[PDB]
Amino acid sequence: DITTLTGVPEEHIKTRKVRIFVPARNNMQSGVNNTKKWKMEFDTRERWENPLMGWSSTADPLSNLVLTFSTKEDAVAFAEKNGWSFDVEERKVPKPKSKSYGANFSW
Amino acid sequence: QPVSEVGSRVISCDGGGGALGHPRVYINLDKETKTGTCGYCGLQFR
Amino acid sequence: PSGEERCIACKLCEAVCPAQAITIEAEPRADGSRRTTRYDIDMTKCIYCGFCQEACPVDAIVEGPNFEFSTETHEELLYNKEKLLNNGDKWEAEIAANIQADYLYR
Amino acid sequence: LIEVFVDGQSVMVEPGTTVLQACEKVGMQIPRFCYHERLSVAGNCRMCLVEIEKAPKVVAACAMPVMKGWNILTNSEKSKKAREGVMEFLLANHPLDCPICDQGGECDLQDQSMMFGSDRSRFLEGKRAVEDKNIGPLVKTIMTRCIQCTRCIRFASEIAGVDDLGTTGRGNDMQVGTYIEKMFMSELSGNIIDICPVGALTSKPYAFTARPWETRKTESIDVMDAVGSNIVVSTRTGEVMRILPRMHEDINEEWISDKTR
Amino acid sequence: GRHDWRLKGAQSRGDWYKTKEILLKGPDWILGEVKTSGLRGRGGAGFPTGLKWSFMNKPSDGRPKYLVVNADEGEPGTCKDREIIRHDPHKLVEGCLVGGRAMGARAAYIYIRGEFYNEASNLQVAIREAYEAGLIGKNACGSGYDFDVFVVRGAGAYICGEETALIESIEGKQGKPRLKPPFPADVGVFGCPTTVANVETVAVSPTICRRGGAWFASFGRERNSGTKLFNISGHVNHPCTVEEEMSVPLKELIEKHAGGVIGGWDNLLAVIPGGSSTPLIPKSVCETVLMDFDALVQAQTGLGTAAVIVMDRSTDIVKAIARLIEFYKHESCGQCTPCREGVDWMNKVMARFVKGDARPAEIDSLWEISKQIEGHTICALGDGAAWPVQGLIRHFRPELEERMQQFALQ
Amino acid sequence: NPDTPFDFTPENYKRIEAIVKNYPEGHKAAAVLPVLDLAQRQNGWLPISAMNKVAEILQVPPMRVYEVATFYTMYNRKPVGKYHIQVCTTTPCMLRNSDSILEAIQKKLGIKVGETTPDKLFTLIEVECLGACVNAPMVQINDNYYEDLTPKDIEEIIDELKAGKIPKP
Amino acid sequence: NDVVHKQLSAFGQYVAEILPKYVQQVQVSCFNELEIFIHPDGVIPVLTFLRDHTNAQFKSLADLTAVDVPTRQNRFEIVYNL
Amino acid sequence: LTYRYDHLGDSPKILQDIASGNHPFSQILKEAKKPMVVLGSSALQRSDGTAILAAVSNIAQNIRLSSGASQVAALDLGYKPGVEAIRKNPPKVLFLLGADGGCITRQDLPKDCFIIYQGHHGDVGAPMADV
Numbered sequence A: 001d002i003t004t005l006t007g008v009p010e011e012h013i014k015t016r017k018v019r020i021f022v023p024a025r026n027n028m029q030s031g032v033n034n035t036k037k038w039k040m041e042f043d044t045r046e047r048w049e050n051p052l053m054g055w056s057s058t059a060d061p062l063s064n065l066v067l068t069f070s071t072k073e074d075a076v077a078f079a080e081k082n083g084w085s086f087d088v089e090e091r092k093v094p095k096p097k098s099k100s101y102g103a104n105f106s107w
Numbered sequence B: 001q002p003v004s005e006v007g008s009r010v011i012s013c014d015g016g017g018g019a020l021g022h023p024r025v026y027i028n029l030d031k032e033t034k035t036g037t038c039g040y041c042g043l044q045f046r
Numbered sequence C: 001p002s003g004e005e006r007c008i009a010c011k012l013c014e015a016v017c018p019a020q021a022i023t024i025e026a027e028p029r030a031d032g033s034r035r036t037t038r039y040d041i042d043m044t045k046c047i048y049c050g051f052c053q054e055a056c057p058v059d060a061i062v063e064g065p066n067f068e069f070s071t072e073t074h075e076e077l078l079y080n081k082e083k084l085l086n087n088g089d090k091w092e093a094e095i096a097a098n099i100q101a102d103y104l105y106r
Numbered sequence D: 001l002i003e004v005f006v007d008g009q010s011v012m013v014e015p016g017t018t019v020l021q022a023c024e025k026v027g028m029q030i031p032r033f034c035y036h037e038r039l040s041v042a043g044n045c046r047m048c049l050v051e052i053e054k055a056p057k058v059v060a061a062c063a064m065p066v067m068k069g070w071n072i073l074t075n076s077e078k079s080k081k082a083r084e085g086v087m088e089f090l091l092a093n094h095p096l097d098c099p100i101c102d103q104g105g106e107c108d109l110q111d112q113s114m115m116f117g118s119d120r121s122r123f124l125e126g127k128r129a130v131e132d133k134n135i136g137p138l139v140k141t142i143m144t145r146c147i148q149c150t151r152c153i154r155f156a157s158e159i160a161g162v163d164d165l166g167t168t169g170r171g172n173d174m175q176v177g178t179y180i181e182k183m184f185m186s187e188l189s190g191n192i193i194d195i196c197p198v199g200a201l202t203s204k205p206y207a208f209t210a211r212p213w214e215t216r217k218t219e220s221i222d223v224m225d226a227v228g229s230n231i232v233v234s235t236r237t238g239e240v241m242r243i244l245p246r247m248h249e250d251i252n253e254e255w256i257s258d259k260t261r
Numbered sequence E: 001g002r003h004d005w006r007l008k009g010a011q012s013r014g015d016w017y018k019t020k021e022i023l024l025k026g027p028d029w030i031l032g033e034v035k036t037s038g039l040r041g042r043g044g045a046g047f048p049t050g051l052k053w054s055f056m057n058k059p060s061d062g063r064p065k066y067l068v069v070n071a072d073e074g075e076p077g078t079c080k081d082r083e084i085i086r087h088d089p090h091k092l093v094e095g096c097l098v099g100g101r102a103m104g105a106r107a108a109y110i111y112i113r114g115e116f117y118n119e120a121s122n123l124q125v126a127i128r129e130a131y132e133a134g135l136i137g138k139n140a141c142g143s144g145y146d147f148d149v150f151v152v153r154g155a156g157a158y159i160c161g162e163e164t165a166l167i168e169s170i171e172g173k174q175g176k177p178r179l180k181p182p183f184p185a186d187v188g189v190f191g192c193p194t195t196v197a198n199v200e201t202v203a204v205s206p207t208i209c210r211r212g213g214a215w216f217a218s219f220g221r222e223r224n225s226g227t228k229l230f231n232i233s234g235h236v237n238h239p240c241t242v243e244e245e246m247s248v249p250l251k252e253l254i255e256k257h258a259g260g261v262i263g264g265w266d267n268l269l270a271v272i273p274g275g276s277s278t279p280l281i282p283k284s285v286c287e288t289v290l291m292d293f294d295a296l297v298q299a300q301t302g303l304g305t306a307a308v309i310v311m312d313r314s315t316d317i318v319k320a321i322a323r324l325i326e327f328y329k330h331e332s333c334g335q336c337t338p339c340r341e342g343v344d345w346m347n348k349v350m351a352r353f354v355k356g357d358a359r360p361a362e363i364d365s366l367w368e369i370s371k372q373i374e375g376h377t378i379c380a381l382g383d384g385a386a387w388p389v390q391g392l393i394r395h396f397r398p399e400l401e402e403r404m405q406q407f408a409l410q
Numbered sequence F: 001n002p003d004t005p006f007d008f009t010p011e012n013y014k015r016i017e018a019i020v021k022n023y024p025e026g027h028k029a030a031a032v033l034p035v036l037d038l039a040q041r042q043n044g045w046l047p048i049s050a051m052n053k054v055a056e057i058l059q060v061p062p063m064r065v066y067e068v069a070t071f072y073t074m075y076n077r078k079p080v081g082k083y084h085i086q087v088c089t090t091t092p093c094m095l096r097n098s099d100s101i102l103e104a105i106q107k108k109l110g111i112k113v114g115e116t117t118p119d120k121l122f123t124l125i126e127v128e129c130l131g132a133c134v135n136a137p138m139v140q141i142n143d144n145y146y147e148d149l150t151p152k153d154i155e156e157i158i159d160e161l162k163a164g165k166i167p168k169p
Numbered sequence G: 001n002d003v004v005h006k007q008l009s010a011f012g013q014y015v016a017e018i019l020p021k022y023v024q025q026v027q028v029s030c031f032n033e034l035e036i037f038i039h040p041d042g043v044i045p046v047l048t049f050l051r052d053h054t055n056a057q058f059k060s061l062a063d064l065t066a067v068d069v070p071t072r073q074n075r076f077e078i079v080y081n082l
Numbered sequence H: 001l002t003y004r005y006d007h008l009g010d011s012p013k014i015l016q017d018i019a020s021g022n023h024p025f026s027q028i029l030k031e032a033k034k035p036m037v038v039l040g041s042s043a044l045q046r047s048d049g050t051a052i053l054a055a056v057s058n059i060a061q062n063i064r065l066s067s068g069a070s071q072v073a074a075l076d077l078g079y080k081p082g083v084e085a086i087r088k089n090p091p092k093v094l095f096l097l098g099a100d101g102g103c104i105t106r107q108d109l110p111k112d113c114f115i116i117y118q119g120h121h122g123d124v125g126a127p128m129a130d131v
């Protein structure tokens, strides 16, 4: 634990959680590249609206933060070094599937 | 604006001039039941 | 020249400004043409780099020749869409003159 | 299960199975359009051409099953010239609509144009363009941006089960639009807005409202059904924009309903 | 074989005779009689026909095995099958029975162009007589083997000339040819294994089964075995169908069978063997090339199924090629992209060429863009559209260029 | 042709069954192409209702039927004239001067290409290789090749068309 | 240029042999930039010799960059130009 | 439904009949590998839902002998009956969302008009609910 070393206010090592996962493919895309490699998104908090101009004014210190990884164990251990609450999720690689142009012409 | 009409078929609308208007686009006129409004220009055709 | 506005909310002016001064919120025209609802910008954050000037495919937003508009109150800096149009109305012969004199080099 | 060489390294690939699936197994990714797993293979849109280790002419990656210790140079120069070759053809008619087309943020055709397609244009004539075919409350057909990966029909006949829409005509002028004005309503009509390769078919209700690089993409699950399908909700800052399916083998698998969408 | 299309006329060809004997209830020897005959594809494929048919030899697997003659009149310059079917249905029928037996095939559908209505009808009549004599069906002209012919009509689709496209045309699906590797040899119509053959091949097969197949081998070059019909057309004195030895030089067959060239001009000029095959410059065309297809391969050219397009310089070559490419552009379904869009592309340019409005540098790109299609489309029609143009760029460049500048003066 | 009306004659049901027999029992869809021809043989034209009718007969979805109706050239969504002229346009006839032919007929009717005569009896159409390539300029009008054409000859044959009889000459 | 890539290569080998108590690897970025690794304890001794002549009279730090990376058993990754 | 499938008759009829193997369909159900019987939630009401469940359960028993939202969550934690059939009128109902069941009847309301409504739309439940 390195909580004292980081200047981070207690609130945000406490009352919020990281949410490790390998990101899903954008489904509009047929691409696969961005899918791989663990990342460490935090939970969303409140974000209201600017009384003037209608801007999405926001309070939380660290909403936009996000971090890539090569391995999940490294990620969990990472947050543990930070003393972080976490929600590890499985890599969900698609099952391989059989394909056949001629099966379309059975009968 | 008056609706421009041409006896041909497909036409190209650049929004007026070359390289000062919207990207060149061709507005089809397959259906005479409706005008051919330009995507960017907003100018109808038939 | 038709009197129609040029902007078509391809919204990449938002997507290329380094200061991200721009904020856009398009909704469909009743006619069904793409349009902005609240194009806005704030000179408080804009750095006058002229990336927006380059970026627009329909050449809508333009970095105008006017260089003086120092003002009393911060809230005035944060231009609304209507304000930009009024600036486009005030200067149009002028701007069209510059672009006319310049575009070949682009 | 047969040994097969992806460009260099040996791979003990499953018997049969398409060359595409082989390189997918090594993880290298062939450029694609018309093919789609959870759909069906087809020979159109020959953007997947790849070069055999020895046989002089390239073959569609999703066509030929691998066998007998094949080697395949995905990065081979002749393959690359092939891909540029095709891409110029696809771009020979797709209308200059990127700024307005609502697919503009992530249309696969753009990225394929970047990664592979030659940058100079060298078409110098006149694009064909065609009238719209109105279809229902939802989908905003535009066509013209159509590239005849039949895909959507292979969606309809093979999953929605409706075969109302289909290809029509020959050569250029052939159209994936259904003949006759009749509206196509179905419960899986919404998912095509996902499936459609380009902006030729995009959701009217969400149209114009937002751009892909903007929205944050939260993961969760549907509630309109107790079926509990996984999803990617997408919000442009403090407000939901659009829903998309998130693939999951036990349930939705890349699909989603429609009332939920 | 031109005279009397009825069975009475087949008697001039000697009818069936010992055909019942040919049915020894096993292809095999006749199959060998085919393989030894050295016959190759008359569809312009040129594939070893006996080898081609041997592929179906495998013990049934229980799915009924079929046969489908590729009868069509789509290619330009090609009117070979017309007078044939109009004047000798029966030998074609006998070939259907013999070769259908060669597959052991249950049946023989035969697709036609729908334009051939009247003789699809007369064919239907002669086939009806074939049922009347007990020649076909149960037992079928002796030997006791059942076999079942049919003849489908078409409807204005030259793409159906391609075999897999035709198979796909049969089920009521559009003439959109299947992707490889499944084959009619593997999965043809419906789901059952099938096969396809040019009218020449099937009509002449029983004659291989009577007169020696080695006798077939005797003619032409050994790798260009046998004989073939030769249409002659274009600037020619007496245009006509003429079957002939494969090895025959072209100036020979023209200046003999065809009534000769109209002058020494065209001898200097291009003359196209078939259509999809490229035109060739030389005053020494035939003087070099021999009509047997391999000799044309020496000339970087296909046989084109032996249709012949004589072309005098009274006519500009460019107008002809352009109109040809128009003929392609109207027809190619377009399911595979490079064809669908590239062919139209080439037409769009050729228009500028006949206009002569094009800048010269374009031609290289054209020749370049042709390369892009040249191997890629899923079926040969795109390739067939591709080649001739490459030949034209290979050759008659100055005509093009000078046409360009002379327009450029304006 | 507002989705109405159409129905087959009984003799036609007879014929279509007689040819539907020609296909293996597992898949009747193969019957689609010939059947349309008969409708074409009947109406002389193809109202959409007829397509729906055939579709209902073979149980196949109407859309596949439309695919077939459109994909081919011989079918005719627009009404044809009592004599639907159709004529070679591919190069070998051009080498044999098909131009003088088409120009002769055009000089006659005054029709320009695909437009019908107002009398609605003739419909000129330039046509891709008829496959009768061996022979001189050629024309066919509803399944009837005419050959060794001379521009006056065709005119004479339009005359004989008005005489109500034709050979195949 | 091939030449520079050669000289840097050989020189990398040269130092690799002169003092291999710690040079984990002497990768040459293909655009002519040599860059050896060091065990963290080994910093002073290497750099020391790096000023000291043999050819390594690489005087003056250009910089002391500190690339970060969340992964890895130890995240921070220090770098010394010379 | 889009695909070919056998159509049956009426509840107790075809159900209890196949359950007693009166239906020929019961036979094909017998020879079938890993049989799946699916019963919709809609059937569970229909006046006598329990009877329908009993019939389908018997079919399950037969196969084995031969051999060869706001719903499933509550039953994961036993909130049955779940149905409003306990009543016995009980004052002060507490809607989580009366937009659904508020369409039914407000019969307890004359006895007690009060209804806390913890919804997220003004639909149905809100207008007929205090607090």
Ligand SMILES: Cc1cc2nc3c(=O)[nH]c(=O)nc-3n(C[C@H](O)[C@H](O)[C@H](O)COP(=O)(O)O)c2cc1C
Binding pocket: E040, E041, E042, E043, E044, E045, E046, E047, E070, E071, E072, E073, E074, E075, E158, E159, E160, E161, E162, E163, E164, E196, E197, E198, E199, E201, E379, E380, E381
């Ligand atoms: C009348 C006719 C038209 C043909 N048209 C085409 C065509 O348009 N495209 C094509 O690729 N092949 C075409 N072919 C060739 C077929 O694809 C097939 O390979 C051939 O007919 C069979 O050759 P074989 O008779 O030598 O076995 C045609 C063949 C015939 C007889």
Ligand code: SF4
Binding pocket: C006, C007, C008, C009, C010, C011, C012, C013, C014, C055, C056, C057, C058, C059, C060, C061, D099
């Ligand atoms: S570029 Fe100019 S016009 Fe196109 S969207 Fe951004 S601002 Fe609106």
Ligand code: SF4
Binding pocket: C016, C017, C018, C019, C020, C021, C022, C045, C046, C047, C048, C049, C050, C051, C052, C053
């Ligand atoms: S001015 Fe320069 S910085 Fe401010 S928005 Fe336009 S481009 Fe981006």
Ligand code: SF4
Binding pocket: D094, D095, D096, D097, D098, D099, D100, D101, D102, D103, D104, D106, D107, D108, D109, D110, D145, D198, D199, D200
């Ligand atoms: S979506 Fe269609 S139009 Fe918009 S960019 Fe991608 S390709 Fe060009």
Ligand code: SF4
Binding pocket: D145, D146, D147, D148, D149, D150, D151, D152, D153, D176, D195, D196, D197, D198, D200, D201
């Ligand atoms: S519909 Fe969607 S898939 Fe079918 S062609 Fe048009 S774009 Fe490609």
Ligand code: SF4
Binding pocket: E159, E177, E331, E332, E333, E334, E335, E336, E339, E340, E377, E378, E379, E380, E381, E382
């Ligand atoms: S390849 Fe090109 S031409 Fe041959 S069939 Fe497929 S599309 Fe038609």
Ligand code: FES
Binding pocket: D032, D033, D034, D035, D042, D043, D044, D045, D046, D047, D048, D049, D060, D061, D062, D063
């Ligand atoms: S997917 Fe291989 S051809 Fe389009």
Ligand code: FES
Binding pocket: E076, E077, E078, F088, F089, F090, F091, F092, F093, F128, F129, F130, F131, F132, F133, F134, F138
């Ligand atoms: S050449 Fe034109 S029809 Fe035969």
